[PDB]
Amino acid sequence: RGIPPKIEALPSDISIDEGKVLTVACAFTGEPTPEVTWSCGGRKIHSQEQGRFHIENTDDLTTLIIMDVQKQDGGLYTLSLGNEFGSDSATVNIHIRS
């Protein structure tokens, strides 16, 4: 009959060295499958097929990938989920290390 979305696991903080690939994964649940939005600074992140930012969404996992991570990529990344029955949201603090 419908189950609102829930983010089941997302880390609160991640530190990665400058220049590496960062991968941030999150498992979620919901019926129907929730729509997934990643954002940073009130702006939605979109996959770039020939760029550094990529989002891979399956029916219960979403992954943010940032290739060759730079200091400018650091910040608070929010995952938001929504379906007909509700919404959820959580933030991960991404730190880029020298």
Swiss-Prot record:
Where is it located?
Cytoplasm; Nucleus
Briefly state the modifications made to the protein after translation. Answer: Autophosphorylated.
Q: In which tissues is it expressed?
A: Isoforms 3, 7 and 8 are expressed in cardiac muscle. Isoform 4 is expressed in vertebrate skeletal muscle. Isoform 6 is expressed in skeletal muscle (at protein level).
> Residue limits of the Ig-like domain?
5-93
Q: Which residues form the signal peptide?
A: none
Give the misc comment.
In some isoforms, after the PEVK repeat region there is a long PEVK duplicated region. On account of this region, it has been very difficult to sequence the whole protein. The length of this region (ranging from 183 to 2174 residues), may be a key elastic element of titin.
What is the similarity comment for this entry? Belongs to the protein kinase superfamily. CAMK Ser/Thr protein kinase family.
Q: What does this protein do?
A: Key component in the assembly and functioning of vertebrate striated muscles. By providing connections at the level of individual microfilaments, it contributes to the fine balance of forces between the two halves of the sarcomere. The size and extensibility of the cross-links are the main determinants of sarcomere extensibility properties of muscle. In non-muscle cells, seems to play a role in chromosome condensation and chromosome segregation during mitosis. Might link the lamina network to chromatin or nuclear actin, or both during interphase.
Q: What do we know about how this protein assembles, alone or with others? A: Interacts with MYOM1, MYOM2, tropomyosin and myosin. Interacts with actin, primarily via the PEVK domains and with MYPN. Interacts with FHL2, NEB, CRYAB, LMNA/lamin-A and LMNB/lamin-B. Interacts with TCAP/telethonin and/or ANK1 isoform Mu17/ank1.5, via the first two N-terminal immunoglobulin domains. Interacts with TRIM63 and TRIM55, through several domains including immunoglobulin domains 141 and 142. Interacts with ANKRD1, ANKRD2 and ANKRD23, via the region between immunoglobulin domains 77 and 78 and interacts with CAPN3, via immunoglobulin domain 79.
Q: What is known of its domains?
A: ZIS1 and ZIS5 regions contain multiple SPXR consensus sites for ERK- and CDK-like protein kinases as well as multiple SP motifs. ZIS1 could adopt a closed conformation which would block the TCAP-binding site. The PEVK region may serve as an entropic spring of a chain of structural folds and may also be an interaction site to other myofilament proteins to form interfilament connectivity in the sarcomere.
Name the associated disease, please. Myopathy, myofibrillar, 9, with early respiratory failure: An autosomal dominant myopathy characterized by adulthood onset of weakness in proximal, distal, axial and respiratory muscles. Pelvic girdle weakness, foot drop and neck weakness are the main symptoms at onset, but ultimately the weakness usually involves the proximal compartment of both upper and lower limbs. Additional features include variable degrees of Achilles tendon contractures, spinal rigidity and muscle hypertrophy. Respiratory involvement often leads to requirement for non-invasive ventilation support.
Q: Tell me the protein's name.
A: Titin
Q: Read off the lineage from the record.
A: Eukaryota, Metazoa, Chordata, Craniata, Vertebrata
- The stretch of the full-length protein covered here is 34252 to 34349 of 34350
